[PDB]
Amino acid sequence: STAIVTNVKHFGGMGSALRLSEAGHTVACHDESFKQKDELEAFAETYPQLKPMSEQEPAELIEAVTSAYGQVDVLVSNDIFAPEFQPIDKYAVEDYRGAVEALQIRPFALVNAVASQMKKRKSGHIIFITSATPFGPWKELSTYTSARAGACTLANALSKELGEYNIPVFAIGPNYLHSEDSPYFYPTEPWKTNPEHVAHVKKVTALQRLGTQKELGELVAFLASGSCDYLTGQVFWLAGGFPMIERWPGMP
Amino acid sequence: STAIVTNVKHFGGMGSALRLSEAGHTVACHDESFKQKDELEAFAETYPQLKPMSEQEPAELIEAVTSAYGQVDVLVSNDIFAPEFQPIDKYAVEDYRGAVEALQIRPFALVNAVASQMKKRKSGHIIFITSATPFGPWKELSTYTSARAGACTLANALSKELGEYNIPVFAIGPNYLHSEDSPYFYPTEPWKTNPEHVAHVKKVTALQRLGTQKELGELVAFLASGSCDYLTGQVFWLAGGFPMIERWPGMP
Amino acid sequence: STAIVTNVKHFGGMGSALRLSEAGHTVACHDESFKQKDELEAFAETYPQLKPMSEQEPAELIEAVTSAYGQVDVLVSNDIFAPEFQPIDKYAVEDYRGAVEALQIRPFALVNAVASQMKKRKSGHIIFITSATPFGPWKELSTYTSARAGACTLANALSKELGEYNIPVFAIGPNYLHSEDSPYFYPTEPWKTNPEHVAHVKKVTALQRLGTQKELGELVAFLASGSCDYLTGQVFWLAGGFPMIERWPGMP
Amino acid sequence: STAIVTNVKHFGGMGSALRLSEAGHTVACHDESFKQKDELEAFAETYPQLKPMSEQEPAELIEAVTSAYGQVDVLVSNDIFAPEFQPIDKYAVEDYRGAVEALQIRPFALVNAVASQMKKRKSGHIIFITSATPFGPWKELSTYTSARAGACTLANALSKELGEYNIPVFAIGPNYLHSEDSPYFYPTEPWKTNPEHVAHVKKVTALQRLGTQKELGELVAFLASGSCDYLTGQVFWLAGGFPMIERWPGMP
């Protein structure tokens, strides 16, 4: 079928896009960098199995893909944002608006623009790539964490109404997902190179390692394949056992 | 001590302000209608125990209450919004921006404006009156429901950093809370007078009745009293046992 | 690899065993009826791809499968119990001891018996088929519901310690899962043939239908395949969007 | 009114019993130590404001109190158990049965024996003192943690059916609750005396301290007073912000 993966160069983009691609799907890709013709061309040449789009806005992206490839069967909203950690009184209100805009309004807008075609055909799959931070908040990251929670609930609430149209909706909230070269949010440097960060991941995850793009890709492909639509409304915590909780003194 | 209750004329406003006042707090009250001198003076006359303020924005409100009453010991962010039930494709992206601005940005702005003084003296209480809809979402109310979820997580996230400063943070998510003359969100009419609505309430809640302003106010006063600060980060589902789930055929 | 599926003739048993077998696993099957040679040989004849075992207790079952097939790579604890709906005062304390023995003690006993070999080689997968009732409890089923919750948490708790040994642990909590000829818990008759039951399902689930054995089996195979071990600790609500919550009067 | 607090000498017993007592309630108390006449007498003399009972079994305790003081209005099931931390393969199955018996079956039995009188009068309050471990499991404590989860869900499930009889049911799951001289579960030594344990509590809780018996007492008295029955079904995490999640390297 035809799928859309946003911010393909970051977060769970390449894992999602490529696995969906390997599955035989036509994968249209979005990314801020695709604004530049040079960037989009370099990407189109490196990945002939993918279809990079120049469109940046939600409804515009949806239309470009629909016209270009017939329709949109699967939506993978790979949302990102660059938040600063900071005491609540140190943030500017605009810092919260920014997080909400990028992490809640964006996925809402994408679904708002594609739900019509999916509901008429009574077929489609919606997947939000959110975050596992809501499951275990770190102090001083209130903007990002609460915005991600809003997106998680958005997905669950959507499943309630789209199910009547045979449209499953899921939310995958990862953490410690190896992002390789992308700074969103666990790049090879220093997460796989620095002893201190490696020790950190070892301590906070049950599997004692970072998650892989392959794992995220496998889940997205599985959910989009229609093999288990009965899981609709599910929020998947892709965080390898995180959070591991500090045990009493005397325990290893 | 001094407490601030926003949108006092609606939702959990009156219950919170009245009970807080009885507990001994000087209660500064905010409401959109207070922009008008005639509305503020009328309220002030009906409720001499309350202290209605005219300030409308978060920053100026906290400053105003601080000048008049020395400081802000308790913040009750009684947030409201007038949403409509709509299939996701029938909403305008603007309708979600509106819900988030009213239900997430606003309480964030209030805490952002008052956190400094509370942290400086290491004392204070923050209470968000959110919603129980995230616990059990209805079809076609994705905007309001997801935004309320963002606020709930915001409260829990904030509890993690403010606890270091001895400042507890809580979220009270009601549903089926009798709002008397306020349209937000269960006015006496029709919820207590129309056969179909009355029956609906007896069906969807375990206690088979609407929640009262007194119960909400009792909880607010209890949490702000300092009697149980160890509950910090808690999201209280004030919905009388809602949601009651449809049982198998034949069961009474 | 080798997988074990318990109570194979009921609940999520057939879906799990059949799909696991298709994936390439040698599937050892347990069932209470296998105590009888006539029942075991009949099953073995109908499903030549499956390997029915006669062993009934956890310890002997794992030992038996280990001798015959070398080792146990995947454990699917498909636990069942025959509860009755009863007001708490109408239950006998014995009825709860029974539910807990069947829904908590049993899976605990299986993991307790197989964990050693999995940890020694640092590989394996553990899947508990629990229930989604804890997500949305019905009145008068406190025994079964609370016991299933104990099992779900058992799975999540186990994921924390076994992750160190590269052993993922998951819980699949279904509801409205078509059990075909099995009375546990949604047999084709009446759930797919009686007007009232059929209508009930369309009302309480988002997808408005029963879950299929194939969907459950797809999930089991996917989790045991090693494609997404990073989901360890996850409780999957396999209930098609259940529970759907009663909306206000007048709404279609 | 008349209340029953079990295992009064341990966990949240003294905080509950005494505060309920200070409120003017007739508080009948149970404790294993009360088996010995000497023990019960020493307690009766030290606390004339409390009514220690010799009965040990659920139904027996309920009858003794009912006959002695007319009826049972409030039930505070202060359940305890002494679990060992241990890899799942190192536990004996009996270790899980023991935890379940003490943490699930006991509270179930108490409610099973008192629900009748409360439902006929259509008045009463049920409070389970469980644990916050299910909210954030430590590795190698699978028996205790999962049993507590079962009790938490038991309370929520019970609220669904008892609400029709105006009977609120709550679960209070504490952690890091100062137990003073009781070994269940955070005695003064070494939790308040040892620098290492003090540093631990400081790190894992948001309020950076142990919870107090007064705080637990205040919540139990509040819930039993009937001031906020609309919170029925609520599970209260009385753990002071726990769990605090390890932040990235470089963060304070």
Ligand SMILES: O=[N+]([O-])c1ccc([C@H]2CO2)cc1
């Ligand atoms: O900004 N951060 O520090 C941050 C940290 C972790 C994540 C996880 C969800 O992917 C996102 C963002």
Ligand SMILES: O=[N+]([O-])c1ccc([C@H]2CO2)cc1
């Ligand atoms: O707009 N509605 O339909 C609505 C319904 C219920 C609530 C609950 C949170 O108080 C708010 C709004």
Ligand SMILES: O=[N+]([O-])c1ccc([C@H]2CO2)cc1
């Ligand atoms: O006994 N019942 O009524 C019952 C109902 C629903 C389920 C769900 C978990 O598969 C099990 C049992």
Ligand SMILES: O=[N+]([O-])c1ccc([C@H]2CO2)cc1
């Ligand atoms: O046995 N332990 O190690 C233990 C630890 C913590 C608690 C918390 C719930 O009160 C109970 C038991």
